[PDB]
Curated annotation (Swiss-Prot), chain A:
Function according to Swiss-Prot or TrEMBL: Component of the mitochondrial ribosome (mitoribosome), a dedicated translation machinery responsible for the synthesis of mitochondrial genome-encoded proteins, including at least some of the essential transmembrane subunits of the mitochondrial respiratory chain. The mitoribosomes are attached to the mitochondrial inner membrane and translation products are cotranslationally integrated into the membrane. mS29 binds GTP and is probably an active GTPase. GTP hydrolysis may be linked to subunit association.
A GO CC annotation given for this chain: mitochondrial small ribosomal subunit
Residues annotated as signal peptide: none
A GO term, aspect molecular function: GTP binding
Protein's recorded name: Small ribosomal subunit protein mS29
Gene encoding the protein: RSM23
Subcellular localization(s) per the UniProt record: Mitochondrion
From Swiss-Prot, chain B:
Additional note from the record: Present with 259 molecules/cell in log phase SD medium.
Protein name (database record): Small ribosomal subunit protein uS13m
Localization per Swiss-Prot or TrEMBL: Mitochondrion
Main location: mitochondrion
Native species: Saccharomyces cerevisiae (strain ATCC 204508 / S288c) (Baker's yeast)
GO BP field: mitochondrial translation
Family in the record: Belongs to the universal ribosomal protein uS13 family.
GO MF assignments: RNA binding; structural constituent of ribosome
Function: Component of the mitochondrial ribosome (mitoribosome), a dedicated translation machinery responsible for the synthesis of mitochondrial genome-encoded proteins, including at least some of the essential transmembrane subunits of the mitochondrial respiratory chain. The mitoribosomes are attached to the mitochondrial inner membrane and translation products are cotranslationally integrated into the membrane.
Subunit details: Component of the mitochondrial small ribosomal subunit (mt-SSU). Mature yeast 74S mitochondrial ribosomes consist of a small (37S) and a large (54S) subunit. The 37S small subunit contains a 15S ribosomal RNA (15S mt-rRNA) and 34 different proteins. The 54S large subunit contains a 21S rRNA (21S mt-rRNA) and 46 different proteins.
Annotated keywords: Mitochondrion, Ribonucleoprotein, Ribosomal protein
UniProtKB/Swiss-Prot annotation, chain C:
Keyword Signal tagged: no
Recorded coiled-coil stretches: none
Name assigned to this protein: Large ribosomal subunit protein mL40
Parent-protein start and end of this portion: 34 to 146 of 147
Keyword Signal: no
Superkingdom classification of source: Eukaryota
Sorted UniProt keywords: Mitochondrion, Ribonucleoprotein, Ribosomal protein, Transit peptide
UniProtKB/Swiss-Prot annotation, chain D:
Subcellular location field: Mitochondrion
Its job: Component of the mitochondrial ribosome (mitoribosome), a dedicated translation machinery responsible for the synthesis of mitochondrial genome-encoded proteins, including at least some of the essential transmembrane subunits of the mitochondrial respiratory chain. The mitoribosomes are attached to the mitochondrial inner membrane and translation products are cotranslationally integrated into the membrane. Overexpression of bL31m suppresses mutations in the COX2 leader peptide-encoding and initiation codon regions.
Shown chain mapped onto the complete sequence: 20 to 95 of 177
Name the UniProt record assigns to this protein: Large ribosomal subunit protein bL31m
Positions of region (Sufficient for general mitochondrial translation): 17-66
Source organism per UniProt: Saccharomyces cerevisiae (strain ATCC 204508 / S288c) (Baker's yeast)
Assembly description: Component of the mitochondrial large ribosomal subunit (mt-LSU). Mature yeast 74S mitochondrial ribosomes consist of a small (37S) and a large (54S) subunit. The 37S small subunit contains a 15S ribosomal RNA (15S mt-rRNA) and 34 different proteins. The 54S large subunit contains a 21S rRNA (21S mt-rRNA) and 46 different proteins.
Comment block on domains: Contains two functional domains. The central domain is sufficient for general mitochondrial translation but not suppression of COX2 mutants. The C-terminus sequence is sufficient for dosage suppression of COX2 mutants.
Superkingdom: Eukaryota
Protein encoded by which gene: MRPL36
Length: 405, 120, 113, 66
RNA sequence: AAACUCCAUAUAUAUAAUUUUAAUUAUAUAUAAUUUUAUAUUAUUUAAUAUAAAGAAAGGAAUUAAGACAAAUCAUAAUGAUCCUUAUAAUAUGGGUAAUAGACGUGCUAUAAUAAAAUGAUAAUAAAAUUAUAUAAAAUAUAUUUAAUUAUAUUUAAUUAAUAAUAUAAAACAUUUUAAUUUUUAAUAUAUUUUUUUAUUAUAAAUAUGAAUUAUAAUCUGAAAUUCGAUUAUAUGAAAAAAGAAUUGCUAGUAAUACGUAAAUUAGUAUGUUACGGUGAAUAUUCUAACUGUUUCGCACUAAUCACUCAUCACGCGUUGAA
RNA sequence: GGCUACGUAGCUCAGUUGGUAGAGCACAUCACUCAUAAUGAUGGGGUCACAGGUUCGAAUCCCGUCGUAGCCACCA
RNA sequence: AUGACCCACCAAU
RNA sequence: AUUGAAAAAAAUAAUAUAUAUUAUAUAUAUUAAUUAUAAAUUGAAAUAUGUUUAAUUGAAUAUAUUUUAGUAAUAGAUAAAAAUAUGUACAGUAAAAUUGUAAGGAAAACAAUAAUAACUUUCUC
RNA sequence: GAAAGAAUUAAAUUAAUAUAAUGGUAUAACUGUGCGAUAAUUGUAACACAAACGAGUGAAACAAGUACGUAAGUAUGGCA
């Protein structure tokens, strides 16, 4: 009553939120689905699969899913092992000499499901995955910022902490201790415990594991170096591989000048911002992971303005010198180019895939009887393939639940 | 949030515009880069201000011209022509369209505020 | 029972009041008491001496002034008249400030006006 | 109508036993507009204060010299 | 009246060497529907209501009669009569039409979440209209650091029109925000919601709505913005909490639209006028009331019910009664 | 002439046994009407006729003048 | 043209 | 009495304890307290015992135990504001007026408004 | 020469006093205060003053006890 939404049920949040967080799944009917594994992909080809509990754990920490995704329809987020995606695509990753791909596509065509299909590989494939979702959340101008003249890069403490925690929690602890500081590190200390007593912090080279470095507790103007080293340790070493995973990179493929004004009102580039450097450089090749199993998947998504960067960069339009920076950051292009970056234009759904999904969609009764009884089967099938622009997974859902005309 | 520059503010209140609000000598663009020099991450609320930081905040407003200090400057610019032979001075002193608006009808506004020390 | 304003008033009152804020009485031993007396008496004597010194000095100055003014009257009447004027609205200059505990950054100003 | 704090029975201070109100005071350093520091006893707990607007930067007190 | 008429719609022919390119069009023409055919109930020789079946089938505009209101115009013009010709006639400069106690009508912009603002360069999507008393594209400089947007300034490309310009339509759609709202955050940890969760501490009626308004500087046009125009930047941020009795528009591509667009009158300014399109509804016929045409009955009214008419009182003035 | 009650918002009438800054009607402003008038919804005015005085607080009160029906009525 | 005025509405067989 | 630090006593008063005398005395001993009194889930803090740091100190920190904080006026033998008007004892002087002074004004509160001979004490040339 | 005290004179009873009016009041009755809260007690009252009487007014003292005060003491209600 007097307390906001005193009632336990919370819907006051913008519905997109109501869908994101509400613990509504609950009711979802439990379905005994096959498990997503790449080694067993021949058994589950063109079928709806559930992720492993270990996969889900890492995916949740990495935030592999998104609020817009109708993930609330089911007890847990599910996917189809599409063969032009999962199967065929993952093969490129486990086969391409550059392991540097960009999952593009048409909005909704699930360029994100794929990326999450990819963190799925990494969970079982036992690698170390470092997704950096909604980059914007660091180019937004909302989180903290300060300089670091030991690196000439504005750093974003608070933001780094979130990403650092994501990597440590999602990745398998053992799979982490495996990398031992390949050198020395000496930063601050504010661990409530040994804080007012031990002035600074120390990591011995071979008694200290990367898991430890990623568990330090530093004071704001230090977390930055923590990252330099976090990455650097993992980076240089060659024991396990890497998957610098960036979704929505588009935002950073274009909107350079960030949001944070510096100290002369002048705008701060997205490259003078530490995470920008951590983000682009690796993409470029200015930073190399030893392990040849180094993997890099960057992927543009729909919620984001478009511009000449990607298209030109990837070679889909000759360089037009006379354009405008607001739509062609010449640099971002160069970086990609000098990095040999490749594209997996995510293909839409085939008719039978549609059926498939719609079949699973029937199970949990996540449909509407206007078409369950009163329609044969082929009827509807052909229909959604149609009312879905011939292949936008989301449209199918948009056209099978949300729209009660 | 506290007694910042005396008439302070409240938490949750992003500082950028907050300054444009309470303060009269500063607003909009002025308040924007005012934070920029003090370098506070934008979209930052009052509660987060590290008291010492407010100190800088205060000094900053001292640097430029803020508070009713300028209210007077205009008051004088008004009195100026007013003191000379100035249609305005009449319009301003009588409480009538100083912008030569609708004296005949819509003029209550002028009568309401337009006056010797206008900004009251 | 009481409002927040009433509470704050009570707190304010307490700040001023001697209720449960004051220590025990300063008791002394007889030897200590004597020592204290000797300290105080000596101090008082010293203060008296200082007062007399200052007072004596002032008296001496006054006598010197008197001696001067008589001489001036004897010699040059106009000069005497000029000296002996009503200094009713005489104001000490605002530069002659009350000496602080520690000195400023710039000790002395060599330029003025 | 009249807002008041209603009095309790007063505590009898006996003749001779009345003690002088020695309030708790800290030695406080005031640095004025210029670097001239001055010690003053003060009831508020702050060992050091530095002042912005004083007599030492006001034109009335020295005519010759957000 | 209807019909022909104009826009608009279906088809068909002719034209366009498909570089004026929109052939999904533009017109000139022709036909077309004021729809028709058939059965079944009713009725009485053949109409209505349902059903099917054939077709694309559906609207708007213009035209508002006679008369009356002695309605409006003698300031569009014109003219009778009457009034002045050294002034009620003509010219220049300045002023006025912009004045303001109150009152009215009409708009505009408003009062925030079944709603407002940034942003969207493979430029989502239009019609109508303008441009030899000209529109004025790209850029170029500044406001301002990048760039974009927005507003001015420099130079005039092309087009005098199915060629080029005004002008990338905007709303919708997506993402991001958003006071009150403690619905927030930010410091921790917490974790199979990660753009999120949870435990703890903190976060004391006009707002980040509203732009009336007030200063200063700057820019347009023209000799000239002072009474008196427009624009912007920096400042200012009143009133306004959906508004009493009462009352207005609208029945379908209409209303509604925080949807834009154009023109005419401009040296110059639209919150107005006249046109264009985008999205696009509920509600309904059954009562009273009002206005009209058809009719009943009544009617003492007839410049006609805003008619007409009656007695007292009050005013002034005759005649004739009682006493 | 001391000597009983009355001196109100434009009009009338308030209030009572204090716990006070009412009523309609007229008036101004809307609306309703073809235009009035009713009707309807909105604002206007008390020095609750003057002095001084009291309980915490008198329109009220005490305390009497400038004001309203007045006061003659042991005559042989 | 003569030609300053108009006044009343209440609820059923 | 017990620890710190590094023979005894001797006024005055007070308390403690005693005892002399149809004398409120003395004797020894020591110098308490001196603004307080229930009732506080939470505030604060002290001690004792539980984990890491150099047996072991400090830190954190947990449980008991308590202590604090119930916040409140007079601090003056008060002195012409309001409070009790009988007794006693001690002590002091009012009002008016005028020059003033944030609001403050005729009318708030507040400050200042006679005279020092002599006398004593202390310093002092 | 100075301080400090003790004060002294003047002035005042116009303030004030439980309340009218007068009389008294700073030697203070008036005011502040500590204590107390008793004498706002109990028997005999001489003797006056006033006075027709009945009444009334002051009151030494004797005795019993209470209070405050180092003490002198004062107190049998209030300045009258």
């Amino acid at each position: 009553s007097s307390a906001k939404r005193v009632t336990p049920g919370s819907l006051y949040k913008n519905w997109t939120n109501t869908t994101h967080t509400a613990q509504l799944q609950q009711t979802a009917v439990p379905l005994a689905l096959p498990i997503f594994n790449f080694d067993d992909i021949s058994k589950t080809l063109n079928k709806v699969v559930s992720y492993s509990n270990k996969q889900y754990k890492s995916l949740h920490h990495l935030g592999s899913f998104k609020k817009s995704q109708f993930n609330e329809l089911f007890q847990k987020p599910v996917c189809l092992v599409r063969e032009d995606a999962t199967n065929s695509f993952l093969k490129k990753l486990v086969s391409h000499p550059v392991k540097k791909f960009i999952i593009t596509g048409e909005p909704g065509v699930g360029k994100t499901v794929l990326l999450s299909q990819a963190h799925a590989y990494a969970v079982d494939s036992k690698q170390i995955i470092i997704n950096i979702s909604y980059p914007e959340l660091f180019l937004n101008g909302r989180n903290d910022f300060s300089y670091d003249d030991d690196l000439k890069l504005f750093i974003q403490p608070m933001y780094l902490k979130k990403l650092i925690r994501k990597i440590l929690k999602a990745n398998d602890p053992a799979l982490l201790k495996s990398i031992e500081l390949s050198k020395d590190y000496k930063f601050s200390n504010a661990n409530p415990k040994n804080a007012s007593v031990k002035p600074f912090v120390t990591l011995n080279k071979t008694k200290n594991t990367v898991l430890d470095l990623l568990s330090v507790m530093t004071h704001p103007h230090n977390r930055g170096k923590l990252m330099k080293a976090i990455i650097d340790e993992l980076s240089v070493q060659s024991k396990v591989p890497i998957m610098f995973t960036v979704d929505n990179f588009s935002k950073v493929l274009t909107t350079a000048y960030s949001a944070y004004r510096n100290t002369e009102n002048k705008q701060i580039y997205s490259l003078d911002l530490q995470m920008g450097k951590l983000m682009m450089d690796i993409i470029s090749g200015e930073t190399k992971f030893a392990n040849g199993e180094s993997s890099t998947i960057l992927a543009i998504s729909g919620v984001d303005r478009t511009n000449k960067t990607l298209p030109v960069a990837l070679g889909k339009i000759p360089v037009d010198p006379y354009v405008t920076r607001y739509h062609y950051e010449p640099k971002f292009v160069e970086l990609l180019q000098k990095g040999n970056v490749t594209e997996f234009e995510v293909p839409k759904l085939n008719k039978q895939e549609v059926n498939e999904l719609i079949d699973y969609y029937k199970q949990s009764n996540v449909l509407l009887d206007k078409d369950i009884t009163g329609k044969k089967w082929e009827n509807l099938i052909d229909e959604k393939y149609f009312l879905s622009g011939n292949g936008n997974p989301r449209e199918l859902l948009k056209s099978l639940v949300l729209s009660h005309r | 949030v506290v007694h910042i520059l005396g008439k302070g503010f409240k938490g949750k209140e992003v500082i950028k515009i907050a300054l444009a609000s309470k303060f009269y000598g500063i607003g909009k663009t002025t308040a924007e880069k005012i934070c920029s020099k003090l370098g506070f991450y934008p979209w930052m609320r009052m509660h987060q201000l590290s008291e010492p930081q407010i100190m800088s905040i205060a000094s900053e407003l001292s640097t430029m011209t803020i508070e009713g200090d300028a209210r007077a400057i205009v008051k004088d610019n008004i009195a100026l022509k007013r003191k000379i032979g100035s249609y305005s001075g009449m319009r301003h002193t009588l409480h009538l369209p100083v912008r030569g608006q609708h004296t005949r009808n819509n003029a209550k506004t002028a009568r309401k505020l337009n006056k010797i020390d206008r900004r009251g | 029972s009481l409002s927040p304003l009433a509470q704050r008033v009570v707190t304010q009152l307490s700040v001023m009041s001697a209720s449960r804020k004051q220590p025990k009485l300063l008791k002394l031993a007889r030897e200590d008491l004597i020592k204290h007396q000797t300290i105080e008496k000596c101090w008082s004597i010293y203060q008296q001496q200082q007062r007399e010194r200052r007072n004596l000095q002032l008296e001496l100055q006054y006598k010197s002034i008197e001696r001067s003014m008589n001489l001036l009257q004897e010699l040059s009447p106009r000069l005497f008249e000029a000296a002996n004027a009503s200094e009713k609205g005489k104001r000490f200059p605002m530069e002659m400030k009350v000496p602080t505990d520690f000195p400023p950054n710039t000790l002395w100003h060599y330029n003025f006006r | 109508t009249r807002i008041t704090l209603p009095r309790r029975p007063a505590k009898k201070i006996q003749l001779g036993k009345s003690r002088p109100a020695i309030y708790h005071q800290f030695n406080v350093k005031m640095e004025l507009s210029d670097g001239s520091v001055v010690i003053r006893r003060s009831q508020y707990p702050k060992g050091e204060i530095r002042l912005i607007q004083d007599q030492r930067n006001n034109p009335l007190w020295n005519p010759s010299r957000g």
